[PDB]
Write a protein that binds this ligand. Structure first.
Ligand SMILES: Nc1ccc2cc3ccc(N)cc3nc2c1
Ligand SMILES: Nc1ccc2cc3ccc(N)cc3nc2c1
Ligand code: NI
Ligand code: NI
Lengths: 173, 171
């Protein structure tokens, strides 16, 4: 263990990615942005994948916090659809650097097998909140659809339509 | 007209093997055995290169709908029919599936590609939206992406009856 030097490094990885993107993520630049010695970076994350895996892992940590601040998601007395659409609305609107950053790391799992189990983590922990309410097959669905709705906004560059989102989300539950 | 195309076919090859990282104007010119930089005459920025590559790769899907008239048939189980064309694409060699996705998902942070990624989004829409309901039309594309990435990113097999269920719930 060496939490802080390690922790500073991860934060700088996230900072480097959001700024220059996955392409601008090397040990020298993380070392620089973290302002720690190059050897400390190669010591804690031998490979770049290790570093990305830890970064994404941390980005996921934040979704949980968001679910924690919005009790309606756990209140089996509230409209899951309308409530989810809303949270997404808030996440999507309000600095895409955080959004793009997290998504870039996540989508990176497509080619880098290392990131797949950490990608799967996100999903298994998100359907968790939906599976705790509805059945498991509807959870697996929601997590999937929900992803496609964000991607549809982030990729096509067409604004987020909360009502549409709530309707399509409703068709699954 | 045939040099632009040779440069394109090349980029699709570069990505299929080195991913988007390997696409470098010189990597393409090298792959298409064309004068270095000659690629710049047709595509100024790398962004232009990718937009053309994505626009050409994105056509695969239109073809498969053609070879499966059963999807244009208003009186046919779209869900199961779709769940099928999807299992075919996700079950045989992912290099095609991967390179197309990488280019498409690249839109994420390269505004250039947004319009292309959106083109294909309505194409697929109307190409099976006109089957009434505007909503179902745009939600179809999103549910497809989700169903796909859920496979491609977590490294868990494509469950067809599951896809069908989800699709059936949408339609
Ligand atoms: N790949 C994804 C998909 C959906 C997401 C929805 C979110 C909502 C709130 C938040 N704070 C972070 C989120 N991250 C996501 C990452
Ligand atoms: N972004 C996407 C989403 C779904 C897709 C489904 C497909 C099915 C057959 C095929 N030949 C190409 C496809 N491309 C896709 C690209
Ligand atoms: Ni070759
Ligand atoms: Ni077929």
């Amino acid at each position: 263990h060496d939490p802080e030097r390690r922790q500073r490094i991860i934060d700088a990885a996230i900072r480097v990615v959001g700024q220059k993107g996955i392409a601008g993520l090397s040990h020298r630049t993380v070392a620089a942005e973290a302002d720690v010695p190059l050897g400390s970076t190669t010591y804690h994350f031998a490979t770049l994948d290790d570093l990305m895996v830890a970064a994404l892992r941390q980005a996921n940590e934040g979704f949980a916090r968001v679910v924690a601040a919005h009790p309606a998601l756990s209140d089996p007395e509230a409209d899951l659809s309308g409530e989810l659409a809303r949270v997404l609305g808030e996440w999507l609107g309000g600095d895409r650097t955080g959004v793009e950053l997290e998504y870039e790391l996540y989508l990176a799992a497509l080619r880098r097998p290392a990131l797949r189990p950490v990608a799967a983590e996100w999903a298994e922990g998100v359907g968790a909140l939906l599976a705790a309410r509805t059945d498991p097959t509807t959870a697996r669905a929601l997590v999937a659809v929900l992803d496609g709705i964000c991607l549809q906004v982030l990729l096509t560059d067409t604004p987020y339509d909360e009502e549409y989102a709530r309707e399509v989300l409703t068709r699954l539950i």
